[model samples]
Target: SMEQVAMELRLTELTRLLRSVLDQLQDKDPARIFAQPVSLKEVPDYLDHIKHPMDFATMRKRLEAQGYKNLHEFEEDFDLIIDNCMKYNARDTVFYRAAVRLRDQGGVVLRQARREVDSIG
Candidate 1:
């Protein structure tokens, strides 16, 4: 479908930009930035802050109190954050990659669960 293709293009561009920024960060501070994962607790709030920097303090505090335990638990809000970031050309690629890391973790966990079930079968 056209929508799917468009989405793929958007994500591809976003990822390419992310990689360019990530390489620069690696050269600057590989020790600190490399392999660090953002807590799910921080993802939504960070996005909220970057997206609405003006009113972020109050909105971010409210988001922190909302009790999202994990990335999967807050997938919708995370997607919205990514969407807004893409729409507005937000350059906070560090947290953007954190979102990707959490997403990858979720996929790994699900793959393990499937493997466990298949082993039992």
Candidate 2:
């Protein structure tokens, strides 16, 4: 019962870590800017590609191969994506996934808590 609640807190902490890093990167200027309206048709090899121009088909395929089946994977990949975003820097992907998973786990905890409370009353 409390495991779910614990998981939620963990996820929240992790997500925050990822978000904090992402926020820092947002301020830095990405080298060699391309046009806008880039799509993740495939999983990008790096984050810079996202800012640069790339084939949607390739991007999509890459993403599929990386396994974006659910929110957990998506968040996990995001962490790697941020670090591998460019040739220069490598960010922590685990933190990103942790954040997302935390939110998901949190929901479970809340629901369980509600049920327990209701049963008590």
Candidate 3:
């Protein structure tokens, strides 16, 4: 389970960060929303449907070429993986759910960073 993996890696901080936003957004099941939105039964089909893999090395080089030397400096590039799918309207349920999961994780990390900066200030 995605939530199990996250717990194994001790993503409590991120979970808390995400929960705060979920609470503010009036999510009904914020505490129970640990797993990726996709269900276990759909996992196999979801994986099969969204297999457009990204070339990490090339992507990093491209980011660096665009003046983003540090890996963390590029956020919008998250969509780069699914750019063509989005542009051509070829996205399926799996792709959309995967993007949402990535977006949610990114949002949590960004919010954590913002909180750190606030504390420092």
Candidate 4:
């Protein structure tokens, strides 16, 4: 429920946030540098986790076991929200973090999955 809710809320905020930030930046291309990228001064361990795929798989499975459906569904929702928000470097960074998180999770999962299969062999 929270993931779905967060997906919705973050998207809404992301849209408005990107628009206003972009207006100030005057351009949205990724190659240029104009303003400081705004990251949370401190990201929590969970929100910005170890990024190991096995860890994500475990977490995702545990969440699924608890009856929370579609972790990736939330991701798709976030994607739609991000699409409307990528007009500035900061806005793009917001989406980039989400993307990088997913990729990191995937990489971690793949690494451990291979180990699991190898051990089975």
Top of the candidates by TM-score: 3
Candidate 3 residue 83 C-alpha distance from true site, Å: 5.6
lDDT score of residue 50 within candidate 4: 25
Which digits, one per residue and each the tens of the lDDT, describe model 1 over residues 5-121? 776555444433233332332334333422333333756555544543311223234334543332233334434433444443444666445434444544444454445434633
**Comparison by TM-score, 1 against 2, better one:** 2
lDDT of each: 0.40, 0.38, 0.42, 0.36
- lDDT string, candidate 4, 22-113, tens digits: 23222332422222322335433422432222222233344344422333433333333233233222435755555444444434443544
| Per-model tally of clashing residue pairs | 0, 13, 0, 2
**Residue 89 in candidate 4 has what lDDT?**
22
TM per prediction: 0.27, 0.31, 0.33, 0.23
lDDT of candidate 3 over 26-110, digit per residue (tens): 2322333222333437455644554443323344454334444222434334344434234423456554454455556656565
lDDT (Cα) of model 3: 0.42
Comparing 1 and 4 on lDDT, the stronger one: 1
lDDT (tens digit, per residue) of candidate 2 on 1-121: 8998676555544443334333333223233121122345644554554443332233344444533322344334433333333433333554344334433544454354435334632
TM for candidate 2 is 0.31
> Lowest-lDDT window of 10 residues in candidate 2?
29-38
Query: Which predicted model would earn the best lDDT?
Result: 3
Candidate 2 regions exceeding 4 Å error are 30-121
In terms of lDDT, model 2 sits at: 0.38
